């Protein structure tokens, strides 16, 4: 019926690369490549946009795309567009960013997924 083994390659961050976060440049454990059959295309009054999954959290408050409605403000930026586009797309995320899991994506603070931790 359904399988999530599409592009289950995964790349480990063995190159000592860090990403700019609210906590500074922080080291992430790695990056995952996943296939998502639908995503949200959000555009802000800031002019920047974000294309992410439905329940992808942004700021520290676990603010997910689907909970954001047009007219709201995300981190000081008014969301003018938030369409759920149901098209299969390849998606990427950073696993365990420093010790915060917050990082800057398109001038927006995003929340990283966690592969490390019990």
């Amino acid at each position: 019926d359904y399988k999530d083994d599409d592009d289950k390659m995964f790349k480990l961050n063995t190159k000592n690369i860090k990403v700019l976060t609210p906590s500074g440049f922080k080291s992430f454990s790695g990056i995952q490549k996943v296939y998502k059959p639908f995503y949200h295309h959000i555009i802000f009054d800031d002019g920047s946009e974000i294309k992410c999954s439905d329940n992808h959290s942004f700021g520290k408050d676990k603010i997910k795309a689907s909970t954001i409605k047009v007219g709201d403000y995300l981190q000081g930026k008014k969301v003018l567009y938030n369409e759920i586009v149901e098209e299969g797309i390849y998606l990427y995320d950073l696993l365990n960013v420093g010790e915060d899991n917050l990082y800057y994506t398109n001038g927006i603070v995003s929340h990283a997924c966690e592969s490390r931790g019990k």
Partner: protein
């Protein structure tokens, strides 16, 4: 379950040599390839 960003999403990274560079999420993947 997954909940990631699109490959065209731009991030700002710091490489090993201490180089700051803005690249897309997918480019970061190819950078670790």
């Amino acid at each position: 379950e997954f909940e990631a960003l699109s490959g065209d999403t731009m991030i700002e990274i710091l490489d090993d040599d201490g180089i700051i560079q803005k690249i897309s999420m997918e480019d970061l993947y190819q950078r670790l390839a």
